[PDB]
Write a protein that binds this ligand. Structure first.
Ligand SMILES: *[C@@H]1O[C@H](CO)[C@@H](O[C@@H]2O[C@H](CO)[C@@H](O[C@@H]3O[C@H](CO)[C@@H](O)[C@H](O)[C@@H]3O)[C@H](O)[C@H]2NC(C)=O)[C@H](O)[C@H]1NC(C)=O
Ligand SMILES: *[C@@H]1O[C@H](CO)[C@@H](O[C@@H]2O[C@H](CO)[C@@H](O[C@@H]3O[C@H](CO)[C@@H](O)[C@H](O)[C@@H]3O)[C@H](O)[C@H]2NC(C)=O)[C@H](O)[C@H]1NC(C)=O
Ligand SMILES: *[C@@H]1O[C@H](CO)[C@@H](O[C@@H]2O[C@H](CO)[C@@H](O[C@@H]3O[C@H](CO)[C@@H](O)[C@H](O)[C@@H]3O)[C@H](O)[C@H]2NC(C)=O)[C@H](O)[C@H]1NC(C)=O
Ligand SMILES: *[C@@H]1O[C@H](CO)[C@@H](O[C@@H]2O[C@H](CO)[C@@H](O)[C@H](O)[C@H]2NC(C)=O)[C@H](O)[C@H]1NC(C)=O
Lengths: 53, 103, 43
């Protein structure tokens, strides 16, 4: 909805709700991982060489 | 390796393909000096006839072929491939000869 | 310098433990009180 005469001041730098956005994306990232597998037995001694090139 | 005259024969030489390659085909009549046929994968120098089919170089995991069409008795020449791959090192020796025995 | 009739309140033990990898294993030592270890049953 549109408004007439009323005039407010804004400030992007001390603005809030960006902080909770930065919290929420991190929390969503962490919630999207616990149903997936761990990679514990992979830390092991590797016998390595160069690829054929 | 033998087919009837006027026909096409299929001649392959060397390893399977790995990356983008450039092939070279040389021929040699017995008792004489060596001789060029095909310098790029499907390109031949001037003064040389057509009907020599080569393989494209883009195909991966294939073998280089050489198809001779409208053969004759003069085409009885020992053949030599020379491959250049972009993954393998430089081959300082030539490939294995595939002698043709014409009919 | 222990008197024979008094008993040690500290025991000194060494054992095996897995390292960060799975293949290596190491020998390490530590201290414990007598009220935490018991005798399994020469050596
Ligand atoms: C595979 O790897 C080898 C590496 O040994 C490549 O050989 C290199 O081929 C280039 C071709 O241009 C040589 O460059 C030349 O070097 C001289 C040195 O002064 C320069 O003056 C020439 O103008 C030219 O640039 C290079 O020396 C040579 N490497 C060695 C160690 O000699 C080869 O090209 C690679 N690829 C294939 C498909 O074999
Ligand atoms: C029980 O605790 C004692 C100390 O309270 C531990 O004994 C110490 O073990 C180390 C093993 O590396 C000994 O170090 C070695 O000392 C000799 C002395 O010259 C040196 O030449 C070696 O290069 C190395 O540094 C240390 O001496 C030893 N302490 C004493 C008093 O001998 C011990 O690990 C514990 N566990 C047991 C005995 O099972
Ligand atoms: C910690 O790990 C070490 C190393 O894996 C263990 O040392 C091993 O101990 C056993 C029994 O003490 C040894 O077996 C014995 O072998 C000797 C000769 O080989 C034989 O005379 C005995 O009858 C017995 O069979 C084994 O050889 C030895 N291995 C090494 C590399 O020293 C140790 O027991 C583990 N535990 C603790 C608490 O130290
Ligand atoms: C460690 O301490 C114990 C406790 O004193 C020692 O056990 C003694 O062992 C001798 C011989 O086996 C007995 O005569 C003593 O009566 C034991 N003491 C007690 C309180 O029962 C043990 O020998 C000690 N070990 C070392 C290596 O010092």
């Amino acid at each position: 909805i549109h408004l007439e005469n009323v005039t407010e001041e804004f400030n992007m730098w001390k603005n809030n709700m960006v902080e909770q956005m930065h919290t929420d994306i991190i929390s969503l990232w962490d919630q999207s991982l616990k149903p997936c597998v761990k990679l514990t037995p992979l830390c092991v001694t590797l016998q390595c060489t160069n690829v054929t090139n | 390796v033998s087919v009837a005259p006027g026909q096409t024969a299929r001649i392959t030489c060397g390893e399977e393909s790995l990356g983008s390659r450039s092939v070279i085909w040389y021929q040699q009549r017995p008792g004489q000096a060596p001789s060029l046929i095909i310098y790029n994968n499907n390109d031949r120098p001037s003064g040389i006839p057509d009907r020599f089919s080569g393989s494209p170089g883009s195909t991966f995991g294939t073998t280089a072929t050489l198809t001779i069409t409208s053969v004759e008795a003069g085409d009885e020449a020992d053949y030599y491939c020379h491959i250049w791959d972009s993954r393998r090192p430089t081959n300082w020796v030539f490939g294995e000869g595939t002698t043709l025995i014409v009919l | 310098n222990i008197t024979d009739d008094m008993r040690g309140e500290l025991k000194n033990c060494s054992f095996n433990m897995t390292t960060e990898l799975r293949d290596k294993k190491q020998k390490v030592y530590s201290l414990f009180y007598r009220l935490d270890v018991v005798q399994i049953n020469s050596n």
